[PDB]
Design a protein around this nucleic acid. Structure first.
Ligand SMILES: Nc1ncnc2c1ncn2[C@@H]1O[C@H](COP(=O)(O)OP(=O)(O)NP(=O)(O)O)[C@@H](O)[C@H]1O
Ligand SMILES: Nc1ncnc2c1ncn2[C@@H]1O[C@H](COP(=O)(O)OP(=O)(O)NP(=O)(O)O)[C@@H](O)[C@H]1O
Ligand SMILES: [Mn+2]
Ligand SMILES: [Mn+2]
Ligand SMILES: [Mn+2]
Ligand SMILES: [Zn+2]
Ligand SMILES: [Zn+2]
Ligand SMILES: [Zn+2]
Lengths: 286, 771, 278, 159, 284
RNA sequence: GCAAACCGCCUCUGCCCGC
RNA sequence: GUGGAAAGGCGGGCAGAGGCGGUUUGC
């Protein structure tokens, strides 16, 4: 299908690669700031009756990375039959352990074909040490803070499916506001800042009854193959309870998920983005 | 009972082999094995050794002919003195006879146990006492009859003072008959214990399955799925233990590994004491991964699904989707254990079962039914140590600082962390008893201290095979664990801030993590359950038992000389967080972690016969970095030295050019050759440099800046003449002579310069002088 | 509520050498880009040095700003280190691990304080965010092209320690940036209230005036500071800009102006269009 | 044995350090082959380091006092300071470099004639190429060669 | 406890090397042995802040060491110090005046905040310490060449030279030559000292104690072998200025300026100190 | 009639202390 | 309606001590 790849060209270090629940929390804070309360409810009603966003994924110089589907670990004997047993063991061990794939290798992994891993991940989790100084006696107090430091041409992006007037009215004004404020982390240290470019991605996904999620989904029925992701963030100082997401790459079957509202004692109601970004996939016998 | 007499039948039937190698009677050891048990029943014994001499006399098919020579001896030897029947005692001999062939699938010499890693190298006979003796597979020597005469003498002493019971005779046979070969042939690598531990496993699982003497005589028990291979693995161990914040300085984090192993034994012993099995049915239990041969009855399949249900639903309540236990089973038959034709059938049934462990870890908590359903729960907070979401009101003040509100399952581990010196194991009893610190999925564990009487129906004792002060109606489960730790001037475990203040040089923490490589391919060469049980204890005993005997400073000629900064002390400040399975995780002072990485791996090169290797990751950190970050880096650095030529040990965080030619991990034989040349010219011993180089470190510190011009681009040759000038005016033309000129052959071989591989010999010696 | 984002751009000129350590062949390294090895000035090291200089400025004028700013009546000049309790009557009320730092504990008190309104507070059931965003100042492209051309950007300076009696020398090495290196800084003020935004710019430009006569990072008292701000352009980025993307923001022009020419010598003369749109 | 120990790129850097009439012609015909290399901007590769090992080995057997060469070594230093965005023309100073180079051989009298003979013989055909030349290029290859002469001068026992 | 701010007394002027200056570094292939330090960007020598702030501290610690019965009635925490060093007994803190082992040397640095608040040395140059750490009040910046010595460098004049010295063996009358680069005499640098006014009670003394160490520096040497000619520094003051607290808030030139552009460093500590700093006392 | 023999570095130090 | 809000890798430290561009006789 034809999507809209919203590239994020970083102006500093991130705190984590963003996810779909903390992009919709960031977009909803943007629309509540530049439009108001009456447009956030129109925004939540647009993801229910229409299409949705995916998680954020890295890239490196027009090489768009996408997560490895979980459809290939039971297949992994049949994927690599044409390789000799002196290296077929360790080929499948680095292939089961992998996290991202290229845009060509993702389209091969959807069809259960032999594919390869990338050699260079576009970022690093570095530990920059900070300090806390007394204002009178200059007394140090070291603590450790971790960042995501990208490379020269690299960054992060997410995908969008849906109608265009929802994008051009809500998501496209939100990403220009969210480029000058941050996406998570210590944004007062200039962390979560970026520039934005809107492009066109086309993915060859086969047609089947199964599909893979490219976002955190919060499923309603039980999915087929999944990978649990137990998180829950913060909301205007109030804490969200931890919730059982599934990570991107998990396999669902005719499952749309659902955005769950929360109370938290605020004036408004807080929605947690529980929608899925489906692309078709081929499975083995279970 | 026929149940306790079948398990003690196959376990005590191949005894009589070590008295044949010693020569106490006329041969054909089925004859001598009868006259060894029957001799034991006379002097200080009961009349059940009189009947257990039937199992050691009617196998190898040399007496069971015409179905009437068995009756004439079992008629006068009366089973009526115990409760057995003429039909029943004759039924159990056919079960032990068939189980002898299902564990082997196959003379008159005296030939040692050959090594399971090299069949051309053999073990000398030793004791399994984990002191002073690393059995290195050396040259094949025929073991003398004077050594088997002393084997039987120590065994005769121990069988008399031990209760005739399956949990008491298994640690007796594991001490003495570990390094004795089962069948004396050329290149036989099956131990005698592991052939008796796995004959009594198959024999009891045939009795529980319901097959009788005509199901053995007609071959009905083979080619029919009457067996069942249980296999279970914990998933999430790296996220379970090390993912804790900057609290619990190495007493808590060492008690996380001891409490996870208690969860492992609380599921394994729950299967055995509920399907009717013994501990011989455990094929192995090594590193959160176990394997049990059981029976294929619908009463057992119905009960394993209830053990799997209660264990998973316990784990989700306690550990909020941080740790999962996938348990699977695959029905196999009698022909499935042995190699048929040329196609291995036991490795095929192990790959059918390993595929069911893979597809179940991708469905991580499916048997919960409240997993993906939300629920409004109010007023929750997190533990400051491990970060688990608990409803507050269940939080409570700790014992370190009463302001920190920690969860109750981490005040039980700080207390348990303080008792690890004063602990000889655990006692496994019911949940609602007194004295229970920690609770498993099925049973609560009490601390069995140094002095006192234990409580519990099953008493786990650590690092010994001797039931010292255990009651005679309790079950003895011996388990091994690498328990070396540095102590403070008090009795407890040392600290991250106390280990790193005795390092000869700058202050860093030394964290190593390493595992055996391509080991699952080695376990596919096993084609019988006894050969799997032999290969999976010897690799397990290296990390359980033969890693404390390295840090104690033994193995002098076998290890030899290693890259050492200071000489190896009597008290190394080294803490073994975990060792077991195939991996270890060891923290300590960074100047003795570095030596021990080349001292463990040299000892692993001689433990196996050179055919298996290690691969070690290494990092050097700050004390105040939390251990969830000092584990995620070294695990990345362990994998960095593993997606390469695989024999490689990472040493230090090194910068390298972005061309793809350069690799971050030294190979083991490469770096050890680079120590024999480069160290006796710039280093003398115990933290000090050589002569004519004292207080001349401005050479060596700026020498790395010469190497950093090579890291930016190897296309420049500017490092070649800058090396020759800085060595020139100091008069050091002899020191480092192959660093001034480029290597013409190396570019033809497409390999890096010798200025690239000189960083990790300089940078270790630089920071191990005061820095 | 949101009105716009005043964007401050320019250059950082290291007139003397610059040390911001990391503690990881020089015995004291400076921080570096993990991929290229270029040094940079952080945002934490530049925000916390603007806040430290401005908290001492407010500490000396607690009794003199009592009527422009409320919630300075709750504080006394000095620290809470002798009387070892947090949020006491003195001014440096919050202890983090060993040092005492002025952080207001409430939303309605940090909204009246001049420090915590701009630099942000933490609170208990308050959590007042900050309004400025301080980006990491990387090297300009004039100085990366000098880096690609084989020049050095960080030197190695060897100080010493000398006995007053026997004159025994004890040297160490300190890596610091070559004096002259241009950077590119960036500060984004967030206009939440349209009444007190002149005060938050005149306080932010005050802490830059203090920082030009103070030092940034490193030894400093031995001459490892001497920062100098060279502004390039100001922006306003109004609420109409973010809705539709049409580029009609208010651009104030200071191509080569100081931090003293911008604070009163131009503050009405440059922000007159900014004040007209409120 | 002298020409066999002097191979293409780098036969032995420490082998020639332990080693009169052997390389009296073998190095000098190679110094004449270095004098045959009139184009200084002809070998970006290892050949500059390959020559300067053989260049500085023929001169370390003679005297070649560095303190007399420092009048030229500071002349290449102060004009490299003019490379770093100072000037664009070293044409008025390479002649001053060649003026002092005639003053270099014109002052050293005694047993330092054959040392200063090859020091006059190698640099000056490359400097004539440097007369009507750019200075950001064809001089960087000269000055990296000029650094390599003095760098192997100390390594083979000079000063 | 109670760190305040009133202004920053900025002392400017020009360092005048009357004899040749030498501040060395460690080792470029061809060049003078024992080189003078140089700016890596412009390729010119300079004077560090460390070689000037520590040298002013070293001349002032010895002057306080020689008067521990005259400053102590005016300065507390000098009853804790008896003149001498801790070189015999290898403890950090005892009754001797030089109470820190830096790595092998003994330098008077106070161990606590409130002890260093009353020391005349450590209130000005600052201190370190366990659990309490008094920072400095003066900052000394690196002194580069003036504007009229950039032009002489561009014209082609030698900013340095190469003096050759010989350590003569006494018995055999044997030479042993070596070279020493030195900045040529008459070359002129530009110093920068900024006293940070934190208390208005005691700044009269901290300006006089700073000018005391400067007057000892015009009588002593600065860097290199100054007992063999390599010192003789001379201060030429340009502008004593105050920079009050209202300067950094407004931005207009509200700074009090004392003008002594052609005076001597001993002619500022001379009686007339309270006349040149009369308008500064009227602002506190 | 005027210069050449030798001498071009020697020996001390090299990160402490605090979170 | 953002795993968020707040947090300077910092305080103290002279590249310094010692040293005549010199003597020996002729080729
Ligand atoms: N108590 C323990 N403490 C520390 N390490 C342990 C302990 N028990 C087992 N281990 C080791 O921890 C390793 C990591 O296990 P695990 O988290 O399952 O990784 P993994 O098996 O490769 N991932 P998965 O394929 O999902 O099971 C195991 O291979 C064991 O060797
Ligand atoms: N002593 C042991 N006996 C039996 N099985 C074991 C033992 N130790 C580890 N295992 C299991 O064997 C497998 C080894 O997995 P792993 O640690 O990934 O090594 P590997 O498969 O050989 N690949 P590598 O990373 O190169 O070691 C895991 O399933 C372990 O649980
Ligand atoms: Mn596992
Ligand atoms: Mn392994
Ligand atoms: Mn492993
Ligand atoms: Zn906890
Ligand atoms: Zn405040
Ligand atoms: Zn003092």
């Amino acid at each position: 299908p034809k999507f809209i790849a919203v590239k994020l060209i970083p102006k500093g270090p991130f705190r984590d690669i963003p996810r779909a629940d903390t992009l919709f929390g960031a977009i909803g804070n943007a629309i509540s700031a530049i439009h108001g309360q009456s447009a956030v409810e129109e925004l939540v009603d647009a993801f229910v009756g229409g299409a949705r966003i995916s998680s954020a994924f890295p890239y490196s110089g027009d090489t768009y990375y996408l997560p490895k589907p979980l459809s290939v670990e039971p297949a992994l004997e049949g994927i690599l039959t044409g390789l000799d047993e002196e290296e077929r063991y360790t080929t499948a061990k680095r292939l089961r352990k992998a996290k991202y794939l290229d845009l060509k290798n993702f389209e091969l992994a959807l069809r259960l074909r032999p594919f390869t891993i990338p050699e260079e991940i576009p970022y690093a989790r570095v530990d920059v040490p900070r300090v806390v100084l007394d204002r009178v006696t200059q007394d140090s107090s070291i603590y450790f803070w971790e960042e995501i430091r990208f490379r020269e041409k690299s960054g992060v992006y997410f995908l969008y499916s849906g109608p265009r007037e929802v994008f051009d009215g809500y998501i496209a004004p939100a990403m220009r506001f969210l480029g000058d404020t941050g996406i998570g982390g210590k944004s007062t240290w200039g962390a979560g800042l970026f520039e934005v470019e809107f492009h066109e991605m086309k993915i060859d996904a086969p047609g089947s009854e199964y599909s893979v999620t490219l976002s955190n989904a919060l499923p309603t029925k039980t999915p087929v193959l999944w990978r649990l992701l137990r998180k829950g963030g913060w909301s205007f100082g109030r804490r969200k309870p931890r919730m059982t997401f599934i990570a991107e790459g998990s396999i669902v079957k005719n499952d749309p998920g659902g955005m769950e509202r929360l109370e938290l004692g605020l004036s408004h109601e807080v929605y947690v983005y529980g929608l899925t970004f489906p692309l078709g996939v081929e499975l083995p016998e279970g | 009972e026929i149940d306790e007499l079948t398990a003690l039948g196959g376990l005590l039937a191949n005894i009589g082999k070590p008295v044949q190698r010693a020569g106490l009677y006329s041969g054909d050891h089925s004859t001598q094995g009868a006259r060894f048990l029957r001799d034991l029943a006379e002097n200080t014994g009961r009349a059940e050794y009189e009947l257990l001499s039937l199992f050691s006399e009617f196998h190898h098919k040399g007496h069971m002919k015409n179905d009437e020579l068995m009756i004439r001896r079992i008629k006068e030897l009366s089973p009526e003195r115990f409760g057995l029947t003429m039909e029943d005692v004759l039924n159990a001999l056919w079960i032990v006879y068939e189980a002898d062939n299902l564990a082997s699938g196959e003379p008159q010499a005296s030939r040692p146990l050959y090594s399971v890693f090299n069949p051309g190298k053999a073990y000398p006979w030793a004791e399994l006492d984990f002191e002073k003796e690393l059995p290195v597979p050396g040259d094949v020597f025929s073991i003398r009859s004077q050594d088997y005469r002393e084997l039987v003498k120590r065994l005769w002493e121990e069988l008399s003072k031990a209760k005739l019971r399956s949990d008491r005779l298994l640690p007796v046979l594991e001490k003495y008959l570990t390094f004795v070969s089962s069948v004396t042939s050329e290149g036989n690598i099956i131990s005698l214990y592991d052939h008796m531990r796995m004959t009594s496993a198959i024999a009891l699982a045939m009795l529980r399955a319901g097959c009788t003497a005509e199901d053995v005589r007609s071959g009905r028990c083979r080619k029919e799925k009457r067996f069942l291979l249980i296999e279970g693995d914990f998933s999430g161990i790296q996220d379970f233990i090390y993912r804790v914040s900057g609290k619990g300085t190495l007493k808590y984090l060492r008690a996380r590994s001891a409490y996870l192993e208690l969860i492992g034994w609380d599921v394994v012993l729950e299967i055995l004491s509920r399907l009717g099995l013994t501990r011989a049915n455990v094929v192995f239990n090594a590193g959160g991964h176990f394997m049990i041969i059981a029976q294929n009855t619908p009463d057992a399949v119905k009960e394993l699904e209830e053990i799997r249900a209660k264990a998973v639903e316990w784990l989700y309540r306690e550990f909020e989707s941080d740790l999962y236990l996938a348990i699977e089973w695959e029905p196999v038959s009698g022909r499935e254990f042995g190699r048929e034709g040329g196609k291995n059938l036991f490795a095929e049934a192990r790959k059918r079962l390993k595929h069911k462990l893979t597809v179940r870890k991708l469905k991580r908590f499916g048997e919960i039914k409240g997993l993906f359903e939300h629920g409004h729960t109010e007023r929750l907070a997190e533990c400051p140590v491990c970060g688990r979401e608990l409803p507050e009101g269940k939080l409570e003040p700790s014992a370190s600082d009463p302001e920190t509100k920690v969860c109750p399952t981490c005040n039980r581990l700080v207390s348990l962390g303080g008792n690890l010196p004063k602990l000889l194991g655990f006692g496994r009893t019911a949940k609602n008893d007194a004295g229970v610190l920690v609770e498993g999925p099925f049973s609560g564990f009490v601390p069995y201290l140094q002095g006192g009487r234990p409580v519990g129906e099953q008493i786990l004792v650590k690092n010994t095979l001797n039931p010292g002060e255990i009651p005679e109606s309790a079950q003895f489960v011996p388990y091994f664990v690498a328990d070396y730790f540095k102590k403070d001037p008090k009795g407890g475990v040392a600290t991250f801030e106390e280990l790193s203040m005795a390092s000869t040089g700058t202050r860093r923490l030394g964290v190593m993590k390493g595992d055996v490589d391509r080991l699952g391919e080695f376990f596919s060469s096993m084609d019988s359950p006894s050969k799997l049980a032999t290969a999976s204890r010897f690799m397990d005993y290296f990390f359980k038992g033969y890693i404390g005997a390295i840090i104690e400073g033994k193995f002098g000629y076998i290890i030899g000389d290693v890259p050492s900064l200071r000489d190896w002390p009597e008290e190394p400040d080294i803490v073994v967080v975990y060792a077991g399975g195939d991996d270890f995780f060891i923290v300590g002072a960074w100047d003795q972690i570095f030596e021990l990485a080349f001292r463990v791996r040299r000892a692993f090169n001689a433990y196996t016969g050179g055919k298996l290797t290690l691969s070690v990751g290494l990092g050097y950190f700050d004390e105040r970095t939390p251990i969830y970050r000092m584990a995620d880096v070294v695990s990345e650095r362990l994998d960095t030295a593993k997606d390469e030529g695989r024999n490689r040990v990472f040493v230090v965080g090194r910068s390298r050019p972005l061309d793809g030619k350069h690799k971050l991990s030294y190979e083991w034989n490469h770096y050890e050759e680079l120590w024999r040349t480069y160290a006796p010219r710039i280093y003398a011993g115990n933290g000090r440099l050589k002569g004519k180089l004292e207080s001349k470190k401005g050479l060596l510190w700026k020498l790395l800046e010469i190497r950093e011009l090579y890291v930016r681009d190897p296309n420049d040759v500017r490092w070649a003449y800058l090396t020759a000038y800085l060595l020139g005016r100091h008069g050091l033309s002899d020191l480092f002579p192959e660093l001034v000129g480029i290597d013409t052959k190396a570019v033809e071989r497409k390999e890096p310069q010798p200025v690239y591989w000189v960083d990790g010999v300089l940078k270790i010696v630089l920071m191990a002088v005061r820095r | 509520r949101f009105y716009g984002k005043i964007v401050i751009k320019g250059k950082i000129k290291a007139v003397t050498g610059l040390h911001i350590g990391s503690q990881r062949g020089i015995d004291n390294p400076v921080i570096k880009d993990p991929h290229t090895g270029l040094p940079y000035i952080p945002g934490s090291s530049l925000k916390g040095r603007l806040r430290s200089l401005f908290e001492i400025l407010v500490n000396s004028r607690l009794g003199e700003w009592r009527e422009k700013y409320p919630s300075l009546a709750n504080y006394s000049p000095g620290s809470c280190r002798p009387d070892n309790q947090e949020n006491c009557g003195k001014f440096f009320n919050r202890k983090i691990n060993r040092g005492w730092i002025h952080v207001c504990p409430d939303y309605e008190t940090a909204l009246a304080c001049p420090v915590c309104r701009l630099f942000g507070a933490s609170g208990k059931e308050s959590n007042f965010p900050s309004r400025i965003i301080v980006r990491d100042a990387f090297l300009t492209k004039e100085w990366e092209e000098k880096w690609r051309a084989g020049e050095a950007i960080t030197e190695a300076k060897i100080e010493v320690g000398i006995d007053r009696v026997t004159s025994q020398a004890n040297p160490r090495t300190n890596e610091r940036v070559v004096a002259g290196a241009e950077f590119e800084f960036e500060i984004i003020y967030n206009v939440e209230n349209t009444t007190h935004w002149r005060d938050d710019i005149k306080n932010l430009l005050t802490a830059m005036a203090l920082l030009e006569d103070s030092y940034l990072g490193g030894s400093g008292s031995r001459g490892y500071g001497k920062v100098k701000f060279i502004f390039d352009s100001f922006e306003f980025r109004p609420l109409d800009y973010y809705r539709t993307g049409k580029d009609e923001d208010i651009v104030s022009i200071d191509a080569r102006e100081k931090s003293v020419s911008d604070i009163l010598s131009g503050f009405d003369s440059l922000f007159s269009e900014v004040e007209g749109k409120l | 044995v002298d020409a066999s120990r002097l191979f293409g790129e780098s036969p032995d850097v420490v082998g020639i350090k332990k080693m009169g009439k052997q390389w009296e012609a073998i190095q000098p015909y190679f110094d004449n082959v270095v004098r045959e290399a009139k184009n200084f901007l002809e070998w970006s590769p290892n050949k500059r380091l390959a020559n300067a090992v053989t260049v500085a080995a023929y001169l370390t057997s003679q005297g070649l006092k560095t303190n007399q060469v420092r009048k030229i070594l500071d002349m290449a230093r102060t004009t490299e300071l003019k490379v770093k965005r100072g000037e664009g023309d070293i044409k008025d100073d390479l002649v001053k470099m060649r003026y002092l180079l005639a003053y270099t051989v014109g002052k050293a009298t005694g047993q330092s004639k054959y040392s200063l003979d090859a020091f006059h013989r190698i640099l000056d055909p490359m400097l004539e190429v440097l007369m009507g030349s750019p200075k950001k290029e064809n001089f960087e290859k000269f000055y990296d060669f000029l650094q390599a002469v003095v760098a192997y001068h100390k390594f083979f026992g000079g000063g």
